[PDB]
Amino acid sequence: YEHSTVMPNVVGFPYKAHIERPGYSPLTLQMQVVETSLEPTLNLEYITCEYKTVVPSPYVKCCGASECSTKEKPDYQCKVYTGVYPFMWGGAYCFCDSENTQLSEAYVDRSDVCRHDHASAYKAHTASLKAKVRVMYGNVNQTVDVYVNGDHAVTIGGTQFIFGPLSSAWTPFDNKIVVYKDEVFNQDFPPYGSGQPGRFGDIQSRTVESNDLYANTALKLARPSPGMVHVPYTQTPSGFKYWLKEKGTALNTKAPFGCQIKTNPVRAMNCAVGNIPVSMNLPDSAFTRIVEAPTIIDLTCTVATCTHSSDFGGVLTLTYKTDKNGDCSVHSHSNVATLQEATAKVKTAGKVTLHFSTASASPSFVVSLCSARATCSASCEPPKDHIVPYAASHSNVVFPDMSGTALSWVQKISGGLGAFAIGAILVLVVVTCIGLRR
Amino acid sequence: YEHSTVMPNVVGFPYKAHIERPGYSPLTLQMQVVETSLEPTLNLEYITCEYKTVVPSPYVKCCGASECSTKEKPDYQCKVYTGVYPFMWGGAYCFCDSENTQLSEAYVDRSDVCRHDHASAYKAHTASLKAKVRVMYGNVNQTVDVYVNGDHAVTIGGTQFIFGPLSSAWTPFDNKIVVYKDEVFNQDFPPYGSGQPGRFGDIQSRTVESNDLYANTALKLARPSPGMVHVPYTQTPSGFKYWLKEKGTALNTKAPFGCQIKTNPVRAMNCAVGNIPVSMNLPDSAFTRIVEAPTIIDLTCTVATCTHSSDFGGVLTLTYKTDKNGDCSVHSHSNVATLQEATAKVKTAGKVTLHFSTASASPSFVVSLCSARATCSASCEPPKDHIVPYAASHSNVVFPDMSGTALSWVQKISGGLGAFAIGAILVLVVVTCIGLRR
Amino acid sequence: PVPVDGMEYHWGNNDPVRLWSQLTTEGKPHGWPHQIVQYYYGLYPAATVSAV
Ligand SMILES: *[C@@H]1O[C@H](CO)[C@@H](O[C@@H]2O[C@H](CO)[C@@H](O[C@@H]3O[C@H](CO)[C@@H](O)[C@H](O)[C@@H]3O)[C@H](O)[C@H]2NC(C)=O)[C@H](O)[C@H]1NC(C)=O
Ligand SMILES: *[C@@H]1O[C@H](CO)[C@@H](O[C@@H]2O[C@H](CO)[C@@H](O[C@@H]3O[C@H](CO)[C@@H](O)[C@H](O)[C@@H]3O)[C@H](O)[C@H]2NC(C)=O)[C@H](O)[C@H]1NC(C)=O
Ligand SMILES: *[C@@H]1O[C@H](CO)[C@@H](O[C@@H]2O[C@H](CO)[C@@H](O[C@@H]3O[C@H](CO)[C@@H](O)[C@H](O)[C@@H]3O)[C@H](O)[C@H]2NC(C)=O)[C@H](O)[C@H]1NC(C)=O
Numbered sequence: 037y038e039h040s041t042v043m044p045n046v047v048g049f050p051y052k053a054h055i056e057r058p059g060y061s062p063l064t065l066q067m068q069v070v071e072t073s074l075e076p077t078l079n080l081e082y083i084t085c086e087y088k089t090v091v092p093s094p095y096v097k098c099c100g101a102s103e104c105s106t107k108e109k110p111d112y113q114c115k116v117y118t119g120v121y122p123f124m125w126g127g128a129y130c131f132c133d134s135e136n137t138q139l140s141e142a143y144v145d146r147s148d149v150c151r152h153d154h155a156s157a158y159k160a161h162t163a164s165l166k167a168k169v170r171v172m173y174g175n176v177n178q179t180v181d182v183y184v185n186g187d188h189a190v191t192i193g194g195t196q197f198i199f200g201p202l203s204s205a206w207t208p209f210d211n212k213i214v215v216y217k218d219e220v221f222n223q224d225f226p227p228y229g230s231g232q233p234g235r236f237g238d239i240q241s242r243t244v245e246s247n248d249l250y251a252n253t254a255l256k257l258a259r260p261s262p263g264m265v266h267v268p269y270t271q272t273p274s275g276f277k278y279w280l281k282e283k284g285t286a287l288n289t290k291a292p293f294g295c296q297i298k299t300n301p302v303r304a305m306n307c308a309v310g311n312i313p314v315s316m317n318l319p320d321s322a323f324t325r326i327v328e329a330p331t332i333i334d335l336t337c338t339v340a341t342c343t344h345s346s347d348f349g350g351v352l353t354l355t356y357k358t359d360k361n362g363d364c365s366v367h368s369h370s371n372v373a374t375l376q377e378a379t380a381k382v383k384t385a386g387k388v389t390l391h392f393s394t395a396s397a398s399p400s401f402v403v404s405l406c407s408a409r410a411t412c413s414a415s416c417e418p419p420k421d422h423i424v425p426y427a428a429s430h431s432n433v434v435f436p437d438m439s440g441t442a443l444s445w446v447q448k449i450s451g452g453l454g455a456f457a458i459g460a461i462l463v464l465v466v467v468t469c470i471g472l473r474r
Numbered sequence: 475y476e477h478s479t480v481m482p483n484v485v486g487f488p489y490k491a492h493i494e495r496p497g498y499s500p501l502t503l504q505m506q507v508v509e510t511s512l513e514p515t516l517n518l519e520y521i522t523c524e525y526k527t528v529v530p531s532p533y534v535k536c537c538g539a540s541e542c543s544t545k546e547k548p549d550y551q552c553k554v555y556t557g558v559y560p561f562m563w564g565g566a567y568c569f570c571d572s573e574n575t576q577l578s579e580a581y582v583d584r585s586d587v588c589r590h591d592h593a594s595a596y597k598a599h600t601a602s603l604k605a606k607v608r609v610m611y612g613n614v615n616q617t618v619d620v621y622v623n624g625d626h627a628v629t630i631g632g633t634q635f636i637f638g639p640l641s642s643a644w645t646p647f648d649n650k651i652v653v654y655k656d657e658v659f660n661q662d663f664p665p666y667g668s669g670q671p672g673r674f675g676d677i678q679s680r681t682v683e684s685n686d687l688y689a690n691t692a693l694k695l696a697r698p699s700p701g702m703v704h705v706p707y708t709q710t711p712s713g714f715k716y717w718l719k720e721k722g723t724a725l726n727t728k729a730p731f732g733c734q735i736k737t738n739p740v741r742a743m744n745c746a747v748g749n750i751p752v753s754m755n756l757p758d759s760a761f762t763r764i765v766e767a768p769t770i771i772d773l774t775c776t777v778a779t780c781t782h783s784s785d786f787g788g789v790l791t792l793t794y795k796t797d798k799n800g801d802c803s804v805h806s807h808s809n810v811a812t813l814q815e816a817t818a819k820v821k822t823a824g825k826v827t828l829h830f831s832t833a834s835a836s837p838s839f840v841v842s843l844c845s846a847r848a849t850c851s852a853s854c855e856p857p858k859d860h861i862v863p864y865a866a867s868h869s870n871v872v873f874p875d876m877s878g879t880a881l882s883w884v885q886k887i888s889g890g891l892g893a894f895a896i897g898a899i900l901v902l903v904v905v906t907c908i909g910l911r912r
Numbered sequence: 913p914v915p916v917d918g919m920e921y922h923w924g925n926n927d928p929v930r931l932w933s934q935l936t937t938e939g940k941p942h943g944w945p946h947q948i949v950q951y952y953y954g955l956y957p958a959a960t961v962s963a964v
């Protein structure tokens with residue numbers, strides 16, 4: 037027996053589906069979304085880590101000269117100075133007083149610990165939603181892991197379940213992402229090969245193990261002081277270390293709809309948005325023939341107490357007459373009020389009790405016990421606690437019924453005004469007819 | 475000196491750009507797309523391969539009864555038969571005449587060579603382009619590997635190049651893809667867990683190493699014949715073997731725009747569509763001061779022969795008077811004609827020759843040698859050869875010039891008719907003014 | 913058929929071979945007006961008629 041339904045994408049909300057096969061007693065399922073996971077698709081752009089400047093020892097040439105040689109090193113620098121007269125602890129070598137040269141050399145390289153502490157720059161697109169759902173009906177429990185898209189069928193106790201694609205296409209990750217350890221940032225990073233010194237991305241590597249490196253950190257050599265051997269240089273500080281203290285915010289403390297961001301792999305979990313269509317296919321063994329189900333007649337519904345609070349703040353009483361005692365299925369056919377339980381024990385005593393949660397001043401909904409029906413109306417008083425630490429258990433519907441107190445007053449007033457207008461129109465029509473018949 | 479241009483995405487097309495700095499002599503670059511590669515982004519769905527049926531030896535219980543036991547195996551089938559009287563070569567055991575029992579058992583499992591011969595079912599989306607462009611100018615000649623999207627800057631001889639995103643967003647892979655060895659198929663495969671017996675996807679596995687297996691092949695057991703021990707069964711043949719014989723076509727022999735499909739990784743190459751914006755940033759050492767380059771005056775362009783064929787079938791001549799001999803950079807400012815060379819040696823003899831390829835009956839383009847200008851117009855005759863094995867070297871523009879023979883005839887006829895109409899207007903105006911003056 | 917875009921064919925185990933056509937025709941351009949229409953009729957034999 038094929039069936040279809042639409043369930044909210046809110047974690048912990050006890051959705052109940054009611055299945056009415058004509059030849060069998062009604063069945064009620066319970067589906068709960070234990071956990072979700074919004075998984076984006078990522079493409080690595082480059083990897084940034086702190087740099088490390090290498091300064092080889094100077095080559096002081098005595099009584100001669102040396103020439104600069106070019107090399108293919110990241111941000112390489114080389115120069116030759118003239119007229120150096122260095123000194124050491126024992127004395128001053130380079131016997132010639134003035135005709136000496138010193139060759140200064142330096143270049144950049146990726147740090148030693150870059151494999152353990154680096155920031156990755158990604159591109160994120162086309163998220164994929166994966167969920168973990170708990171399905172319980174009849175006497176079968178169990179929790180399954182289902183991809184939420186229209187092409188993954190999972191069977192729970194002989195019933196085939198297909199969870200349709202999510203209603204909305206909203207993702208909290210922008211197009212460009214920077215990931216660092218366990219934090220995700222919505223950032224726009226420079227293109228590969230065009231990073232600026234002193235900010236994020238001064239040195240870039242295509243991958244952690246990739247040999248190529250692009251470095252642009254304004255390394256500049258200077259002339260050594262007289263009578264000294266030191267190779268002076270200047271360089272704009274690391275852009276990664278600057279980024280660390282001025283990155284600003286995150287996405288973990290910034291994401292909408294209250295969903296926590298995690299890493300490895302990047303994913304956004306328990307993120308309440310949209311609806312999840314569900315398709316089913318149940319065997320014949322799930323239902324019970326209508327002859328075995330108890331016969332219920334003369335169903336009347338009364339409400340003892342009501343309070344439109346988050347928890348189940350209503351008590352419901354049903355009176356009936358039965359021939360045998362057994363099990364019925366209880367469901368509420370409007371989303372203004374949600375029943376706590378899905379089955380009840382019908383007895384010859386003729387009285388059962390139920391709990392429901394509502395969020396409107398005056399609810400009106402129809403409840404069915406096995407095959408019977410009854411219309412319930414009640415007046416609910418507001419709660420007293422200002423703040424509670426648990427989520428709402430109702431569907432958040434506020435508009436009262438047309439038979440409520442406020443709507444009764446509106447109906448009475450509008451009826452009076454309509455009666456006055458009708459009397460006016462009748463008088464005018466009578467006068468016009470008398471005038472025209474003259 | 476920042477510059478920008480748009481160059482066609484056609485392999486082997488010799489694009490030449492004219493950079494005309496106000497203070498320096500003009501420059502001509504040459505860019506060429508040696509190779510292109512379109513990379514989709516893939517998400518593996520499952521793996522399929524030929525199945526293998528495992529049939530354990532029957533358990534014949536002499537003088538007794540046996541009971542079937544359920545197991546968690548893919549497509550497990552077990553049945554118990556009564557009244558069996560097996561036989562063997564030397565005699566028939568199970569002394570009891572009819573109180574015997576045979577238990578038949580069978581189940582299916584992934585084949586032995588499924589790790590070598592299997593088909594992957596992917597989902598392909600959001601292609602990324604990548605090219606290999608050869609850039610040559612002046613004394614620079616190099617080939618670079620570039621990502622064609624506006625975020626990869628590559629330095630060629632001191633010049634920065636950024637190749638913008640492709641103009642169009644056309645990709646040849648549908649949403650769903652089935653890959654086998656070196657062939658890509660545009661196919662719609664059944665969802666995981668809902669494969670049907672006898673067709674593609676009768677057995678599905680989430681990954682080649684994954685322990686779980688979904689199998690659905692309709693394996694059914696049958697009662698053994700009297701006096702034998704054989705465990706009969708019937709099963710619907712493999713779906714991977716039906717698919718191999720009835721997959722039909724491919725994508726390697728079906729893709730539009732003439733682009734080859736290759737596998738490992740999945741990629742479509744040399745696939746002519748759209749335009750590639752290019753951004754540049756040249757240093758000041760590429761250009762030459764206008765004082766140093768020759769001065770060209772009195773430029774006349776005369777066309778020797780023209781034949782609007784695919785190769786360079788037109789010969790051009792330029793006459794000039796120059797003070798000193800050096801180098802110029804020739805260029806054609808209209809895409810009707812495409813020259814072959816981007817540099818000519820000017821001499822005091824005052825005569826240089828150039829080759830161009832055009833595809834219109836009567837072209838008209840303005841050519842410039844260093845700083846001079848000239849307008850060239852010629853009459854071209856069609857070529858005789860019906861079919862040639864090399865691609866067109868022109869931009870394939872056909873509309874002739876307004877000075878061509880056909881458009882000269884149209885202009886003359888329209889002018890005669892317009893003169894007639896104007897004369898008639900004048901006659902009517904004179905007549906009506908005379909009539910109104912009375 | 914080999915349009916001006918050209919085509920490729922795969923024969924047995926050999927490599928695919930590509931063949932491209934040229935804008936060739938039978939009329940005479942730069943002739944009498946009854947020959948220019950003929951030239952632009954071998955090429956595009958559907959818009960020349962409409963334009964004329
Ligand atoms: C031992 O110490 C003496 C101290 O002078 C060194 O003699 C010096 O040798 C250099 C190299 O041959 C000379 O430089 C040359 O200078 C001329 C100009 O006069 C120039 O044309 C050459 O190209 C070269 O640069 C230097 O002049 C000379 N000293 C003097 C005072 O002339 C000698 O090299 C030392 N030997 C060792 C093994 O260290
Ligand atoms: C289907 O299975 C789940 C998980 O096995 C059942 O939920 C479990 O319900 C029992 C009570 O029926 C929980 O045990 C008690 O939980 C309270 C919570 O405050 C705790 O204080 C007690 O010490 C005791 O552990 C159990 O924790 C709970 N498990 C989970 C994961 O929530 C569910 O009831 C089953 N369905 C049916 C119809 O029973
Ligand atoms: C040697 O051969 C004799 C053949 O008579 C075997 O005797 C058989 O023993 C089995 C023991 O399970 C008897 O089966 C039982 O039969 C009763 C009545 O049908 C049934 O209610 C029990 O549930 C059980 O199936 C079988 O009847 C009996 N054959 C007779 C009495 O003719 C003996 O077991 C053999 N010894 C071996 C193989 O070691």
Ligand SMILES: *[C@@H]1O[C@H](CO)[C@@H](O[C@@H]2O[C@H](CO)[C@@H](O[C@@H]3O[C@H](CO)[C@@H](O)[C@H](O)[C@@H]3O)[C@H](O)[C@H]2NC(C)=O)[C@H](O)[C@H]1NC(C)=O
Pocket residue numbers: 610615616617
């Ligand atoms: C700019 O540099 C590239 C290479 O970086 C030059 O490519 C050269 O292209 C020519 C033909 O286009 C190649 O010559 C060919 O050699 C093969 C060898 O078997 C021969 O069979 C052909 O007939 C032809 O002679 C040449 O190898 C290649 N140079 C390389 C790969 O280093 C290009 O020509 C340069 N630009 C200019 C204007 O020269």
